[model samples]
Target chain A: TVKPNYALKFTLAGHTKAVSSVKFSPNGEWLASSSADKLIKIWGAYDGKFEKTISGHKLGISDVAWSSDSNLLVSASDDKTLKIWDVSSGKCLKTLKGHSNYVFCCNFNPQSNLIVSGSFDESVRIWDVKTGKCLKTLPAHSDPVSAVHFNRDGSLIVSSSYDGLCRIWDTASGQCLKTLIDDDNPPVSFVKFSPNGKYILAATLDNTLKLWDYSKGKCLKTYTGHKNEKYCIFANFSVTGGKWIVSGSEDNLVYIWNLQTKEIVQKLQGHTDVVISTACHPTENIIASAALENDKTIKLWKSDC
Target chain B: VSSVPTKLEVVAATPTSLLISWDAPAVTVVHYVITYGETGGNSPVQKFKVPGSKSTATISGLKPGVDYTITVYAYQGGGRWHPYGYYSPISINYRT
Candidate 1:
């Protein structure tokens, strides 16, 4: 039998362009991939079988996030809008607008009643998920915002930008709580609050991932050994183990590092180009990652045990 | 699909490394993919490729005292249209 923590379960090919983001439903039932081809494809999470494709965005898609219950999905697109979809019907039910430029990142709060998004227009907006109304907008950063994420309890939101900073915001009051910046001032490409909601994992463009103890505004650990100075790649905490940091790289590989030791524990290979984005299963030992244009595919890796 | 590599051997080379060697399948191939992961498949997984002509690889910087599982994929090329070939029951390997 296999001995590694993971092996490629299978590779999915169909998107004609780069696959931008891969998201696993909160319920761990489906895997959704968004692409530059302006299409969102859904697959069976346990088996990696093709389910259906949703296409409606006028421009290419940048990101997609699932609602807390897994029945709805929200997508951010180059069309400068965020659209909510009914997962079962593949239909766009609500189009949330108001961003002046491309919408880059989006996330559904744990309550599933509100969604937050970041954009090229240098603003972050929180929207009402059901009514499709923009509730609040924060002049978040001086540059394009790359990613936004909600804390575990949906009380706080963390947003990172091309301006070399990640800002913590109060979800209800739209007030800035704190600004996190590295010593070198490298632009943060992606940021997320840990599962326990006490720390933040920031993927900086300087080829490093830093784990921050957000309460003290201090960097507790730094993970390196990956090439990531160009594109806005997404990095995350490996699910369940709570011991490793996972991120796709410009090196056409995915790197998993020991959280405390900050050492490269495993390098996932298979993509012929950049491994841009990744998503982890909620209840299972699986990680899903997608590649760029030259090697357009989604690889699903599951644990041996 | 092409024939699959056989008799794959995996052994601990160092505290944080594993030495892997395998036999080439009896057919033309372009390359092979080696995916190594945690024993229980809990946290994260790793992968890499080796040329068809090579028979061994050393995966380093791993966790000691922890078990691992690695998979070998044999792929043939004909305009990248043909499906990859490998032995059935895909978790084909040895204990390290």
Candidate 2:
């Protein structure tokens, strides 16, 4: 029985406000974080040394992401806009704005030169990375779109809306593939695709993380553990189809599960307040989380190390 | 569409920096332009030939202790750039 341990040997410093999101760069050598203090800081994963800080957002930043090659970083802020930063230069290279309300989440497409973001305005806007032009704005969600992510192939996008429904779209056609909703519940807060792009996983205010097989348009399984509603959640597919699922709860706990057996494998518990966001290491079983509490901190956890 | 250009917006605006992104027009367009200026239409900065051409853009590098008004618009069907649309509530950005 392998127990879980904190991979966070080093606690990175230099954030004035509550850290809201923490994500490891695709290469796994660097970590990027956004805070309510209206700043985005990049850190070294191994040393936890504060590398660079980019302060440009008027309101707090809600999310930050790295490009596939790791040269560029993208962020979403409550200021109602998304900006792309050059990590090496520590400069905001590009900005995308158009949402009517606070921007919640954004991502760089894994396989193509594209960007996608959701906002409290209840819209998801897709962009072409090269021209900094917004390709389209999908307004299917009734409430704010909380999370937006592209699948492995970049052919599809998975989005979670405050309306409590999860919808999939064809990136090329800008048409909705399917929308999943429970009988009567608020929209999901976040939805993500498996690393393998085989299934879609979503976190709901209903306190459950549901898995859907896209091929069948039917939910494959449901895993529930935390007593509090899911504040943030992420999913990854290992090469062997043994998927890794990590979730942060308002209950102040982060849980990792084995998607194969649909079993709760381990719990990354340390945050004293509401856990807001999380990200997985590209190659390892390691995970990182950001918290909002009395002290306001971000911690990293690894299952194997 | 006659004015087939994307909607450009200012997402994050700070004392010394402004984050701006734009929405490409529903129809295909040739290019997009972003422009920013100070409160009295003073100091201004513009970036063209953007990289992501996404739904938004972030504009930075403003007078830290100054207030700036920003504008954005799209160029359509290989036509001249559209008149820059304005956003109310000018942003007061300062860098420390």
Candidate 3:
């Protein structure tokens, strides 16, 4: 089986503060990490060598998104602005501002010409990449909009809020198409559209990740067995064949669940504090995770299959 | 029911202050409760409120490069404060 050979790889220890977000570039060439230290650091995806640090945000960075071509990156910060950065030059090209509140998270559309952002202002906005001006604004949620994502084709947008609801929107018109809410109304921290655009996954404050069918507004499965009440923990699908779901935990473990069986396949442990962020390599059997405060290092896990 | 706020972001920050933002839940909220202080310390916390229509708030008088925990909650018909989603208590070690 492919499960037996998974093992821990080396760690990236450069950020002195808690690492808030980690993402592998779309081309799978580089890894980017934003931290509470107000810096964005880049590393080689394969060799894990330290590359360059992009600094300008006056506050902690909350999220980062990579362009499809892998030449640029966008970061949302507590500084109340979204900055577009040129990867090779390590320079900030544009600073977009329209959100009246904290801009929590952001994502680039497939075309790379547009960016969608969710803010604490309870709004979802679409922006033109070149002009840096907002195109459309959907007063999306009642609570802070924690996460925003686009479907595979970039026609639809999905957002989750602390109000414990997931909402789908039409990208062009900025219209709400459907709203998914759990009966318990537990706060939702993050939401993402499946690679195939057939499903949605969300992380809730109640210590569970829920998979949903967007068309019918039905919850397909609930993956649990991890302590996640502290930070905004995240879960992502494995890159191999989308066979497993991996997430960080407040229990200081990385839990991987079999997508088909909905059972825990592996519980990787090494961090000294809450594991808040996790990212699976785009085309390889490797995973990276970031922990909270006392443990600022990013650990990589790989399989020898 | 008062839903928790979501999408908390730090729009601006300096050693002594922070400008935070977020999206409100889907219901009508009356106000927001904000609290902040040094993480895990017994230091007195600073707390305040902003009108429900306001999605952003600025916190001041903070120590530079020191980690602090911040929390935001929404209030409506209920008297209790409901926390913002995943980041009910956001920890940040500010950069100088």
Candidate 4:
């Protein structure tokens, strides 16, 4: 099938405000999004149709993540709560509440039943996902912790804060492992551990992506092609047959960088506003990123070979 | 507000490989020293030494997944060392 280079495949519009995060199920069967419109939307992967809309957060949703099994969607909100929803029935299963302030983001560990979250109160807390009990309270930085993630191995936890520092922590003992200092002085918006746990990739407010060494705790390489703050970044070590990293920025561009050479290999430009959340399609070289400018729209991009 | 003085934060502290860095001091001639031990002892088995001008140090040869603390001190001249601040000795789980 031959399609035009500038063709818009599909656009989904529903949320009334800025869409903060979007994620794809591990099986690539569905996509999930959260927004300031106080809604959690589950959309179809290829067609971009609204599958379901979940509303419960009193204020608004900030971020969302899928369970490793692909059966659950865990959402965090500025309303200071975390909720686990059943993706199949679109029912809010369990609401996680304990934070003293607004919870900004939450994520489930890849290996175990642990959930980590960051909040506006300047703290990062780890919880046993099944038990819903606070395991460790890490007083990480003076500013709000924006994003938190566990390396694919469940050995390391990476946390980013508004203080412009990203700290990687040892999962078991809750010790800070790495504090990535950007030479450009950009506040790190998100820190995602590479799929293989080899590198901790960070998206900065200065419109750059930085890769840090896992063992040495030192920054190794930086990929900067976007001209605005890159809020969301993910890699498809599996999608590219183990060779590509992707990022979406406030500049309204999605870039695919080759980790081997540290170069931007592909540039996806279709979103109108800030491209907030981007996740690589689990099985294919396809990617889905959503933008929230005038409308909360989801744009799906497929690699043209 | 107590001036919100940029406190001594153990940004990246671990056991096997530890990197401790802090903010710029209000005064000059700052000398930082890190005293670390295995379980619970006043004297640290290893010590890291650097001038106040240098705000960061990477401490190695530490046992991964242990507790340790690094303290900072401002120096006067050759002999006197004033303990300006100290960190609440955190556990070094270097695995993550």
Candidate 5:
């Protein structure tokens, strides 16, 4: 398979602090971005027109994700709180507060009724998306939790940590079914599940991205081009499909790799500082990248095939 | 509905460069994609793109060329180029 070509479409600036994460609505109508500025803003269609700002977290917002149907948003924050927002009306639907430390990452299950989050407290919690209540808490990691995500089926949870491991958990039994560790045991900063749920992708502090066939406990492929020894940077599947991988780097460029060949296919150059997070539109050929403190801007790139 | 593109043309510029040109679809669209690959063999597919206003582009720096299937697709609906749009037979330059 071939990857699409992306061109910078917009450079959106709004937050007073560094942008940590960017998320696209499943229905392809909106974009929600989080920042250390302690706010999340909703942006319009392809052009990123400013829609509304969400401000309820007492501390910096670390991550944001969209629901299955795309009308709501879930955000993780430094205040040890995760809030759900009704994006259309700009209302705080729920404030889930239980973590002892900062909430580092957040995601909604495939059904969008369950929310999963990893925290600096070294725990992972599953929440009732509508009730703002914690349904389950698993001490899934030995060190601070860095990132967490639900598999495509929503039956399993994948959590990564600063302890140099990514653990897979059974959603119903809270059992850590498998632990994925590297030979060097590098501190893992980010992890995500593939579209088919047969594999998981992770970013370690050693500056390498590993694609693991979690079902067999094997590291299938390793991708590296950009620098990353600090600041939890990550890579995600391309917007059109998983034929490619897109990532933000501490080196200030967005890197893309052809999954089949594992080649560094493209590097988007625009940001002057570290890019910590990137978002892919669910159905289109557009990518959203967020830079850290120095740049404090989000760029949208459109692609064609 | 927009019209499919017509009068597709392809020529050689470099040993690896394929120069292509096409007429606007009967209806105007916002995006155009130019793609080429081995017609009946296994090779990496390369695509070059142009805006709606453009009808010309070049697919450059390919490998040893033989016969290639080059296609053109047009996008009409608000930046979306879904099916029901036009595509040309688009094959050129057969080398023995």
Candidate 6:
């Protein structure tokens, strides 16, 4: 039986522009949002209180990620650089430069020794955190590279691009081990490795979400029933055993899909514009989402259970 | 160029190599010419042609922790190379 445990809890409003991305710290104590207003705002993950605003990027910030330790944060921007920040002081620690174009995505390796970023310039770069030096460059794509990620053990890296393919790499050798492509070749907007690191969940421009067996280079399943073609929609694996897949849709609603059955179990309504991003807390029955231009707020949801 | 592919992106990267991909253009094209190298250096440049139907490629043997530039060109049936498109948002990249 399905329990109606999901309920809207709070709405956070502060940014003047559309929120591009939102992420929870590893420990689930802090939440952060990167917005087109060139700002990164921090909030209390549970209480939803506005904490501080970080301003450094000259252009709209594209994405932000927290370090594994949760003590540091990184932000990428259209300004062509990635900046590392100290969570406690809310101060910029270092500015990493190398990409010749806007930095669209960034992440810290599990060990926190490296920073990986993807850019519209069709490349992915790895950086040394301590020296802020460009460690290597992967002329990674023919089109804009949209997202880059490191697996749980930091032994593998996966990237998704406008080219409609998700490529996997060997972290130690920088070798392309596999490429996951949809039959229809839809542009993949976002991708995340499953908690156990065996599967990959990708959000596509085809208005669908796909699950792939990365180790086998196979497409396992595709989840639909949501409108996502018009915007940068996002999806995530539920924190509880990763059985459920939740996504934000351009239909101004949120969707929860049953991973095994490939059925959409819940349709959440409340947002007035395209839901651009959604994130699930690491340990709680809570989820947070941010909307597009007209709906400049972050909404928090909780399972009534 | 008539119409070139858009949305170039990286699929994967390691210290010495990268796997890349891009969207197919809306128009008809025969093949693509992929070019890459260090931003300011002309020596040791790498170029390869891929079928028109394909959208992904991998670059290898790169130095660790260095920045490089990459671009692609489209060729139609006429045998002439056309400027496909530049990686916008800017064309520089580096490896981990």
**Cα TM-score per model:** 0.75, 0.72, 0.78, 0.70, 0.74, 0.76
User: Ranking by DockQ, best first?
Assistant: 3, 6, 4, 2, 1, 5
- Cα deviation of A241, candidate 2, in Å: 11
Q: Find the candidate with the highest TM-score and give its number.
A: 3
- List residue ranges in candidate 1 displaced over 4 A: A1-4, B1-96
Task: Give a tens-digit lDDT track for model 5, residues B20-96.
Answer: 77776667654676667787778768775567788888877666556777777774421000111234334444341
- What CAPRI class is candidate 3? incorrect
lDDT of 3 at A36: 81
Candidate 1: tens digits of C-alpha lDDT, residues A58-159: 888879999988999999897888999999999999999999677888999999999999986779999998799999999999766888999989999999
True contacts kept of each: 0.00, 0.00, 0.00, 0.00, 0.00, 0.00
**DockQ of every candidate:** 0.01, 0.01, 0.04, 0.02, 0.01, 0.03
Decide which is better by lDDT, 3 or 6: 3
Q: Per-model TM-score of chain A alone?
A: 0.97, 0.92, 0.97, 0.90, 0.97, 0.96
Candidate 2 Cα lDDT to native: 0.68
Between candidates 2 and 6, which one is better according to lDDT? 6
Per-residue lDDT over A147-175 for candidate 6, one digit per residue giving the tens place of the 0 to 100 score: 78898898888898877889888877778
Q: How accurate is candidate 1 locally (lDDT)?
A: 0.82
Model 6: how far residue B83 lies from native, Å: 23
Each model: TM-score of chain B? 0.77, 0.53, 0.76, 0.59, 0.71, 0.75
Candidate 2 per-residue lDDT over residues A1-305, each given as its tens digit? 43344445655557786777788888889999988888988887766777888878888887888898888888888777788888898876777778756777889898649999887556889987777889999986865577888988899998887567888899999999888877777658678887778888877776777788877778888878864343444444433223556777666677767665678776666677666776777777666777664437777655453
In model 2, state the lDDT of residue A96. Answer: 79
Q: Which ten residues in a row have the lowest lDDT in candidate 3 chain B?
A: B78-87
After superposing candidate 4 on the true structure, give the runs of residues whose Cα lies further than 4 Å from its correct spot. Answer: A1-8, A182-185, A230-242, B1-96
True contacts kept of 1: 0.00
| Two-way DockQ contest, 2 vs 3, winner | 3
